Amino acid sequence: QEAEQLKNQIRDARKACADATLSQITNNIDPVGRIQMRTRRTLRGHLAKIYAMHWGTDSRLLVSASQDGKLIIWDSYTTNKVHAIPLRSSWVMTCAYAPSGNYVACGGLDNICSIYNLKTREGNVRVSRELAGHTGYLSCCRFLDDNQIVTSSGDTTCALWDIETGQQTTTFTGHTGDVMSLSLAPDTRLFVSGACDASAKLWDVREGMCRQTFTGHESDINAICFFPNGNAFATGSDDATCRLFDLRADQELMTYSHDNIICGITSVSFSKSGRLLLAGYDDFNCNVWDALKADRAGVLAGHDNRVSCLGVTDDGMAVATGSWDSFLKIWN
Amino acid sequence: TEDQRNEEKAQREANKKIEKQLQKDKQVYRATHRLLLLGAGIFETKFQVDKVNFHMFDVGAQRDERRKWIQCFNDVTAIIFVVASSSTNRLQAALKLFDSIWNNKWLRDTSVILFLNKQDLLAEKVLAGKSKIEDYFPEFARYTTPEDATPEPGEDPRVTRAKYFIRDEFLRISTASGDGRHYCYPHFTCAVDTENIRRVFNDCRDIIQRMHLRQYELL
C-alpha cells in the first residue's frame, strides 16, 4: 500500500501547522451578543414536508420543493406563490434557483435532475432538459450558470453537466458512501462535497479529481457551505457538531459543539459577513453559532418539526428556514 | 400608485388561481395512500381497492445502504416489508433491517406490514440441507406451535411451526420497544399481487382509524 508513511507525513504536516489556532486568537474579540430573531413572515401553503429550498439572486423570490410533488416559488416581500410546478416524481430531495432566474432545477429520488424553464415565451412552465445518468438518488444540485449544473448523487459521485446537451461533462468520483450536501465557491471554480463518510472533499470543476480531502467529523455529513471569503467552509454532520475547515490550512480550525445537543445538524449556512453561522438541527431549532468564538448566540425555535433546509439571502437581509411541517419561515 | 397596483393585482390574481389549483390538488393528495416496498437487505405502481388510490413506491434503483434515503418515507402511511423465509442467511439480515426500521428516530411513527414470501419454498428448504432453519436458529429446535391458532389446511405441522416461529420472532422484535404510532401487521403469502391488495387495504384502513383515534386521544 505504501500510504501509511504518507498518512504519517500528512498528519505531521497538519500537526506542525496546528499552533496558535483561532480558538485562542479570538479571545480578545468582543462577543456579538444575544441576537433577537423574529419570524417576519410564514410562507404556509405546502402540503407535504418541505424538504429543500434555495434563494434567488434578487433576494426576493425563493424556491421551495416539498415531498407532495410540488415546487413553489414564493415572493417573500409580498408572500405570493408566483409559480406552482407539478412534479412528475413526488419524492424530491433538492432544488436550486438559477442565478439569472431563468431556470429552476429539481432533483429527487427518481435519480433524475429536471430543469424547469420559468419565463420562456409561453406563459406556462415546462421542462427544458431532463438530465439522467446517475444511478443513486440526487441529494443536492446547484446552478453554476444557465449553461452548466453541478449535482451530487447517492452513488458516491458528483456530475457536472451541460444542460443544452444533457451529457456528463465531468464526473467527480472518489467518495465513499452517499453524498449528501453540495456547495459552490464564489468564484464557481472549486466546490466542496460532503458524503456519508465523515469526509469533505474539495474538487475542481475544470479537472475532475479530488483536489483536497478534509476529515475531522465522526459520522455522516449532512450539510456544507463555503465561507463568503471562499478560503474556508463549514460542515454540519450527524455528530451533533459543526466544524469550520480551511482550504489553505488543510485541517480543522474550530468545532461548534455543545453539551446538551444530542441532535445531528441537518442544514448549515453562513451570513453575509460570515460572522454568524446558522445551523438547523434535528431538535426542531436553528442555532446561530458565533463563527469566531464558537459560542451559541441565538435560537430560532419557530418550527414544530425538524428543519430540512436553511437559506440566507445574497444581500444578507433575511434568513429563510424550511421544516418538515410544510411551513417555511422568514427571520430577520 | 396605480403603476404598481396594476402588477400587484396581477400577482394577486396569479396567487388566487395558484391557491385554487393547490386546493384542488390537496383533495386528491390527502385521498391517496402512499406506500413503500422493500425486500430483504419500475419505480411506482398505482392501483385502487374499494375506490381508494394506493401509490406503492418500489425502490430498488438505489444502492444497498439505506440510512439516508429511507427517512423520506417517514410520512408513508404503511411500509410494506417482504421477507424471503427460504434463507444464505437472508432471514437474519431481514430481521436486523426490520429492527433498524422499527427503532428508527424518524420511522418510529410509521406502521409496518410484513409479507413472509417464499412460503412454499421453505417446505423443501427445511429438508434440502443447504440452509437449515433448525441449524441457523437452534432455539427453533425446542420451539413448538405457540398457541392453538388454526393454520391453513393441507400442510405439514413442521412448515407451519417454522412460519409461526418466524412470525413470533418478528413480533418479538417489534414489541420490544413500542413508542409511537408504529404497529406491525404480519401476514402469510406465497405470491404478491394476488389477493394481497385486500389485506394491504384492510391494514391501511386500520392504521388510519388508529391514527384518528390517537388524534382524539381515545386510544
Partner: nanobody, 128 residues
Framework: QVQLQESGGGLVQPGGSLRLSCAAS????????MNWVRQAPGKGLEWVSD????????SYTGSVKGRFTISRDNAKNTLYLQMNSLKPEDTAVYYC?????????????????????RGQGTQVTVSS
C-alpha cells in the same frame, strides 16, 4: 479520522478458542453501538453480534449464540470478542463495525459496499 484497527485471528484448530481485539480511534467510543460482521469465502457479509454503548442489550446471531461473547472497555476504548468451540464453517473474515448513529439504537451496517465505518477486518481459519 474514523479508524478501526483489528488484531488477533489466525489459524486455530477446530473446537479451540480465539480472541479478537478492535481498537477504535477518532471518535467517542462510549457513544456508539458496536457490531461484528463476518464474511465467509464466496458468501455475503452477515451480522454476528451487537453490543450497546455500555452494554445492556447484547445480541448474537442464532448460529453462534452461546459460543461467542462480546465485551467493550470504554476507558481503554476497545472491543473484545471471545470465540469458543470453533467450527470449520466459522472460518471467515471478521470486521468490527461502528454503525453511525450516536445515542440511538438504529443503524444499518451490513452492506457489502464501501462502508465507511467498518475496519479492514482480520482472517480466522479452522484447520483439520
Amino acid at each position: 479520522q474514523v479508524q478501526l484497527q483489528e488484531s488477533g485471528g489466525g489459524l486455530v484448530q477446530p473446537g479451540g478458542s480465539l480472541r479478537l481485539s478492535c481498537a477504535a480511534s477518532g471518535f467517542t467510543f462510549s457513544n456508539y453501538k458496536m457490531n461484528w460482521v463476518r464474511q465467509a469465502p464466496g458468501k455475503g457479509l452477515e451480522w454476528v453480534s451487537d453490543i450497546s454503548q455500555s452494554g445492556a442489550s447484547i445480541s448474537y446471531t442464532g448460529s453462534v449464540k452461546g459460543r461467542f461473547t462480546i465485551s467493550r472497555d470504554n476507558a481503554k476504548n476497545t472491543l473484545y470478542l471471545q470465540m469458543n468451540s470453533l467450527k470449520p464453517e466459522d472460518t471467515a473474515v471478521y470486521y468490527c463495525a461502528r454503525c453511525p448513529a450516536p445515542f440511538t439504537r438504529d443503524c444499518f451496517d451490513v452492506t457489502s459496499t464501501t462502508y465507511a465505518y467498518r475496519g479492514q477486518g482480520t482472517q480466522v481459519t479452522v484447520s483439520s
